Amino acid sequence: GLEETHHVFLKGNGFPARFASHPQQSCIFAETGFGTGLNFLTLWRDFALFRQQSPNATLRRLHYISFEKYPLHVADLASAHARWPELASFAEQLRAQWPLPLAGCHRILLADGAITLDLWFGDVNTLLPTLDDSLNNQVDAWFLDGFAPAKNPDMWNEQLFNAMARMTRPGGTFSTFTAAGFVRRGLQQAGFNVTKVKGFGQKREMLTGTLPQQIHAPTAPWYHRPAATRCDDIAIIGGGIVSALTALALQRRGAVVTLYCADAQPAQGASGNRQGALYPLLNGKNDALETFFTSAFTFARRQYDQLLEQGIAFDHQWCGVSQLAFDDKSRGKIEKMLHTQWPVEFAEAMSREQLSELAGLDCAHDGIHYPAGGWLCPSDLTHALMMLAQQNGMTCHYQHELQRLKRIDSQWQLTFGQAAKHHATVILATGHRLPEWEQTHHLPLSAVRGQVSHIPTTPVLSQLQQVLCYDGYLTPVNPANQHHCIGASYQRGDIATDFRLTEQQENRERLLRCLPQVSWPQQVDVSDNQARCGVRCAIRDHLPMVGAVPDYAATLAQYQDLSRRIDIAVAPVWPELFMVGGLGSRGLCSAPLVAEILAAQMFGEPLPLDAKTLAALNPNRFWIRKLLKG
Ligand SMILES: Cc1cc2nc3c(=O)[nH]c(=O)nc-3n(C[C@H](O)[C@H](O)[C@H](O)COP(=O)(O)OP(=O)(O)OC[C@H]3O[C@@H](n4cnc5c(N)ncnc54)[C@H](O)[C@@H]3O)c2cc1C
Ligand SMILES: C[S@@+](CC[C@H](N)C(=O)[O-])C[C@H]1O[C@@H](n2cnc3c(N)ncnc32)[C@H](O)[C@@H]1O
Ligand SMILES: [Cl-]
Incomplete structure (x- = not known):
C-alpha cells in the first residue's frame, strides 16, 4: 500500500x-x-x-x-x-x-x-x-x-x-x-x-x-505571458483590494515588495465600501468569462476562509446570494445560466417561494441561488490585508501619488508630486486611474462612478438573510453597525465622487421598480443621505486585465503578418512592467485569482487556467483580436 x-x-x-x-x-x-x-x-x-x-x-x-x-x-x-x-x-x-x-x-x-x-x-x-x-x-x-x-x-x-x-x-x-x-x-x-x-x-x-x-x-507567442527578471525589488502602485492580494501572493514566493499609495490610507479608492456582494457571474455559454468566474469564485471563498482560519478579521457573511428574475431580460439571462448542470452547492434554480423561504422576506420573483456567496466589507478586508502584507515585510508609503514613470537603465524612475524612488520591477494596481500613463493609455479601460447608499435597518429589514440582486442589490443588515448597503449608480466617464441626491434616490427607486409586487421595500430609507461613492474600472468584455503591460506601437508593428502564419516572435511589452486591474463590480470575487495569476506569471511558474481563459484576461487581448484577422 x-x-x-x-x-x-x-x-x-x-x-x-x-x-x-x-x-x-x-x-x-x-x-x-x-x-x-x-x-x-x-x-x-x-x-x-x-x-x-x-x-x-x-x-x-x-x-x-x-x-x-x-x-x-x-x-x-x-x-x-x-x-x-x-x-x-x-x-x-x-x-x-x-x-x-x-x-x-x-x-x-x-x-x-x-x-x-x-x-x-x-x-x-x-x-x-x-x-x-x-x-x-x-x-x-x-x-x-x-x-x-x-x-x-x-x-x-x-x-x-x-x-x-x-x-x-x-x-x-x-x-x-x-x-x-x-x-x-x-x-x-x-x-x-x-x-x-x-x-x-x-x-x-x-x-x-x-x-x-x-x-x-x-x-502561442502573441498571447505570451513573460516572467519578471527580478522579484527581489518590486513596487506596487495602488492601495486597493487587488494590491493587498497581489502583495500577499508574491510574498509566498519570497518576493520583496513595496507599496506606494496615493492616499493616507489603503482602500480609499473603490475598495472602500461597507458591504459588497460576492457571487459568480454565469452565463451558460461555457466561454472564457464563465470559466474564469467559476474558478475565481470558488478560489475566492477558499482563500477568504483560509485567511479567516488564521485570525484575519473582516465583517462578512456567507449568507448566500439570491439573484432575481425581475425582468423579461433578467429572466432570460437566468434561464440561459441554468442550462449548464451545476451542483446545487454552487448555483441552483429556485422559485419565488423557495427564495422567499430562505430570505425571510417575500422576494417577489423566482430566480437563482448561490449558497456559498454572501457579503463582505471590502474596507475592513483591504485594511486587514495590507497590514498582514506589512507585517510580513511590505514597506508602505502612503500619501505617495505617482506622477511620473520612467525606465532609465534597468530601473523604473518614480516621481511623487517628496523623495523620488527607483525600482527594478513595477506593478500598476491603480483601479480606474489605470490608463493614465504614456505606457498604458492605449488600453480600452473605462471609469464608471457608482454610489452606494447606507441605510438604517428596521425590524422587518433585519429579517433579510440573503444579499439580493436585481437591477442593483441590497445587502442584509451588518450586525456590527445596524445598517445595510443598497446600490448602485452606474455613470460611465463620470469620475467625481461627490455625494449626489439624484443617485441616492435612484438606489431606492431601483429596489421599488424591480420588486413592485411586495411592500417591504418601502422600508428602505435613504433620506439621511449617507452613502459612499467610488469609481469602477470597466472592461467591455467583463473580464479583468492582468499581465505584462503591453507595448501598443511595438505590437501593431511586430504583428502585421499575424493573420497569415496560422516560428513567430513573443509579444512586445514594457520591460519589467506589469499590471492588474479592470475588476468592474466583481473585484471581491476576481481579485484573489487575478492576484495569484500575476504572482504565478512573474515567477515564470505554470498558471491555473487554460489557454483561452488566460488569453481572455491578457492586457493586449483587444489589439490582438483586430490583427488576428486583418
Ligand atoms: C459603487 C460600487 C459598488 C461596488 N460593488 C461591488 C460588489 O458588490 N462586489 C464586488 O466584488 N465589488 C464591488 N465593487 C468594487 C469593484 O470590485 C472594484 O472594481 C474593485 O474594488 C477594484 O479595486 P482595485 O484594488 O483594483 O482598485 P481600487 O480599490 O479603486 O484602488 C486603486 C488604488 O490605487 C491608488 N492610486 C491610484 N492612482 C495612484 C497613483 N498614481 N499613485 C499612487 N496610488 C494611486 C488609490 O490610492 C487606490 O488605493 C464596487 C465598487 C463601487 C465603486
Ligand atoms: C489508481 S486510481 C487513483 C490512484 C491515485 N494515484 C491516488 O493517489 O489515489 C486512478 C484514477 O485515474 C482516474 N482517471 C482514469 N481515467 C482518467 C482520465 N481519462 N482523465 C482523468 N482521470 C482519469 C480515475 O478517476 C481514478 O481516480
Ligand atoms: Cl463593494
Whole structure:
C-alpha cells in the first residue's frame, strides 16, 4: 500500500534524494489520476521531512498538478484515508479544502503556501490540448498513474504521452506502475529514454524515464505571458483590494515588495465600501468569462476562509446570494445560466417561494441561488490585508501619488508630486486611474462612478438573510453597525465622487421598480443621505486585465503578418512592467485569482487556467483580436 506508492512514484523518480540536489526554488510534479490523493500525500509527507532536515536547501516550494475525470466526494476521501493513519495530518489539511466537482482548474494553497496543488477536474485527453504554454518544459517529475491499461486503455494513448513530454523540463522524469509494451513504445516515441525496472516485491514490472532534450512545442507567442527578471525589488502602485492580494501572493514566493499609495490610507479608492456582494457571474455559454468566474469564485471563498482560519478579521457573511428574475431580460439571462448542470452547492434554480423561504422576506420573483456567496466589507478586508502584507515585510508609503514613470537603465524612475524612488520591477494596481500613463493609455479601460447608499435597518429589514440582486442589490443588515448597503449608480466617464441626491434616490427607486409586487421595500430609507461613492474600472468584455503591460506601437508593428502564419516572435511589452486591474463590480470575487495569476506569471511558474481563459484576461487581448484577422 504505502510502501508501494513510495517505490513506484517517489523512488522511481529519484526522491527523496532529488529534493536535496534540486537546483531550483520550487519543483513541479504532474499526475494523471488524482483519485484519493495517495501519491500527493505521500509526496507531501516526504517533502515535509526534507524541509525539516534541511531548512537551508534551494528547494522551498512545491507545485503539484493533477487531472481527475471522476472527482470523489470529500467523505469518500475521508473514508479511504483511514487506510493510512500516518498521512492523517496531511490528509486532514487536504480534506479541509476539497473543492466541489466543478469542471476545470481549482488551485489549492496548502502547507502555509509552501504547496500549490492544481486540481483539474475533467478527462485528461480532453483537457490537454486546451492547456496554456506556461505548462511547456515545466514539469520535473510525472506520476503516470490511472486505471490498469488492460482493464482500461482509454487514457494511455500517444496523444497523452506526447503532451507529457512536451510539458516536461529537460532532465525531468516520469514513472508509472505499468509495464505494457505499447506504453514503453508510446513514451519512447514521445521523446523519453525509457528504463524497465522491477516493481514492488517483484510482483509486476514498471517503467521510468527522463526527457533528454526539450521538446519544441506548439506555442502561442502573441498571447505570451513573460516572467519578471527580478522579484527581489518590486513596487506596487495602488492601495486597493487587488494590491493587498497581489502583495500577499508574491510574498509566498519570497518576493520583496513595496507599496506606494496615493492616499493616507489603503482602500480609499473603490475598495472602500461597507458591504459588497460576492457571487459568480454565469452565463451558460461555457466561454472564457464563465470559466474564469467559476474558478475565481470558488478560489475566492477558499482563500477568504483560509485567511479567516488564521485570525484575519473582516465583517462578512456567507449568507448566500439570491439573484432575481425581475425582468423579461433578467429572466432570460437566468434561464440561459441554468442550462449548464451545476451542483446545487454552487448555483441552483429556485422559485419565488423557495427564495422567499430562505430570505425571510417575500422576494417577489423566482430566480437563482448561490449558497456559498454572501457579503463582505471590502474596507475592513483591504485594511486587514495590507497590514498582514506589512507585517510580513511590505514597506508602505502612503500619501505617495505617482506622477511620473520612467525606465532609465534597468530601473523604473518614480516621481511623487517628496523623495523620488527607483525600482527594478513595477506593478500598476491603480483601479480606474489605470490608463493614465504614456505606457498604458492605449488600453480600452473605462471609469464608471457608482454610489452606494447606507441605510438604517428596521425590524422587518433585519429579517433579510440573503444579499439580493436585481437591477442593483441590497445587502442584509451588518450586525456590527445596524445598517445595510443598497446600490448602485452606474455613470460611465463620470469620475467625481461627490455625494449626489439624484443617485441616492435612484438606489431606492431601483429596489421599488424591480420588486413592485411586495411592500417591504418601502422600508428602505435613504433620506439621511449617507452613502459612499467610488469609481469602477470597466472592461467591455467583463473580464479583468492582468499581465505584462503591453507595448501598443511595438505590437501593431511586430504583428502585421499575424493573420497569415496560422516560428513567430513573443509579444512586445514594457520591460519589467506589469499590471492588474479592470475588476468592474466583481473585484471581491476576481481579485484573489487575478492576484495569484500575476504572482504565478512573474515567477515564470505554470498558471491555473487554460489557454483561452488566460488569453481572455491578457492586457493586449483587444489589439490582438483586430490583427488576428486583418
Ligand atoms: C459603487 C460600487 C459598488 C461596488 N460593488 C461591488 C460588489 O458588490 N462586489 C464586488 O466584488 N465589488 C464591488 N465593487 C468594487 C469593484 O470590485 C472594484 O472594481 C474593485 O474594488 C477594484 O479595486 P482595485 O484594488 O483594483 O482598485 P481600487 O480599490 O479603486 O484602488 C486603486 C488604488 O490605487 C491608488 N492610486 C491610484 N492612482 C495612484 C497613483 N498614481 N499613485 C499612487 N496610488 C494611486 C488609490 O490610492 C487606490 O488605493 C464596487 C465598487 C463601487 C465603486
Ligand atoms: C489508481 S486510481 C487513483 C490512484 C491515485 N494515484 C491516488 O493517489 O489515489 C486512478 C484514477 O485515474 C482516474 N482517471 C482514469 N481515467 C482518467 C482520465 N481519462 N482523465 C482523468 N482521470 C482519469 C480515475 O478517476 C481514478 O481516480
Ligand atoms: Cl463593494
